[PDB]
C-alpha cells in the first residue's frame, strides 16, 4: 500500500504537434491525456503505418 501527499509525485504530459507534412489524423484521449495519431503509407513496403503517441 502507498500513502502519498498530493505533492509527492509530479506527472507531465505533452501532445506532439502533427507537422504539416503528414496526412491529418485525429487526436485521441486516454485517461484525460491527449494522444497524437498519425498515419503514413509506406510505398516501398506497400503498407500503411500508424503511430499513436505522447
Amino acid at each position: 500500500a502507498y500513502l502519498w501527499h498530493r505533492t509527492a509525485f509530479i506527472l507531465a504530459y505533452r501532445t506532439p504537434v502533427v507537422p504539416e507534412g503528414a496526412k491529418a489524423g485525429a487526436s485521441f484521449s486516454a485517461n484525460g491525456v491527449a494522444l497524437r495519431w498519425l498515419a503514413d503509407y509506406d510505398y516501398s513496403q506497400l503498407g500503411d503505418r500508424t503511430l499513436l503517441d505522447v
Binding site: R14, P16, V17, P19, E20
Partner: protein, 55 residues
C-alpha cells in the same frame, strides 16, 4: 552595293539575308530544404511562420 554610272562592266553583286538565332535554356534548380524531428517541431519551434518559413 554601289557601282559607277554608265560603266561598261554591267555586273551586279547580290546581297544575302541570313537570320541568326540563339537559345534560352532552363537549367538550374534553386531550393532550400529543412528537416525537423517531431521533438523539435513540438517543443523547440515556437511559431512555424516567423521561425522557419520566413528565413
Amino acid at each position: 552595293n554601289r557601282r559607277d554610272l554608265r560603266d561598261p562592266d554591267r555586273t551586279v553583286i547580290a546581297s544575302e539575308l541570313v537570320e541568326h538565332s540563339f537559345g534560352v535554356t532552363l537549367d538550374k534548380h534553386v531550393y532550400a530544404a529543412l528537416k525537423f524531428t517531431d521533438e523539435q517541431r513540438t517543443l523547440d519551434i515556437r511559431d512555424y511562420t516567423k521561425q522557419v518559413l520566413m528565413p
